[PDB]
């Protein structure tokens, strides 16, 4: 289980260091408060944060960018869906989103490797199956 372990590490260390470390990110780090937000669960189907987003890595549900990108990605539509396109809180999603493709480009060689020996080990657990 250790490429993915490794994996994970990494995920989280892009959320903690860079989107979290965004200015006035504060909004986006744990779920919303229907006390303080009170319309946001009527309006938002899917909701999405960053401490579900590492309380998710910490479970390993992401083996790769891609379902790791979704969750990222929805923080940002949901924002522009509540928000609008040029509000503040989009502004500051947006900047989450762009650290973090720009993050995961910089280390796009190890992520490529530890993605594909993730699916390697997959198959050997199938070969025993
Ligand atoms: C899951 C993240 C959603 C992002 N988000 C958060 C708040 C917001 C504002 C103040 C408090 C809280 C909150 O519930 N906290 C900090 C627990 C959320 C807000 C207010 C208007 N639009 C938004 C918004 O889009």
């Avoid at 289980?1 to 200015?23: G, H, R």
């Avoid at 009170?38 to 390993?60: F, Q």
């Avoid at 940002?76 to 999603?93: C, F, I």
């Amino acid at each position: 289980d250790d490429d993915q372990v490794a994996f994970s590490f990494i995920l989280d260390n892009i959320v903690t260091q860079k989107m979290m470390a965004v200015p006035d990110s504060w909004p986006f780090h744990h779920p919303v408060n229907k006390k303080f937000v009170p319309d946001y669960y009527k309006v938002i189907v899917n909701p999405m944060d960053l401490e579900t987003i590492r309380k998710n890595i910490s479970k390993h549900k992401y083996q790769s960018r891609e379902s790791f990108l979704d969750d990222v990605n929805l923080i940002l539509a949901n924002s522009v869906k509540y928000n609008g396109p040029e509000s503040q809180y989009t502004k500051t999603a947006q900047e989450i989103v762009n650290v973090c493709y720009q993050t995961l480009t910089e280390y796009d060689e190890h992520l490529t490797q530890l993605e594909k020996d993730i699916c390697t080990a997959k198959e050997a657990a199938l070969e025993e199956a």
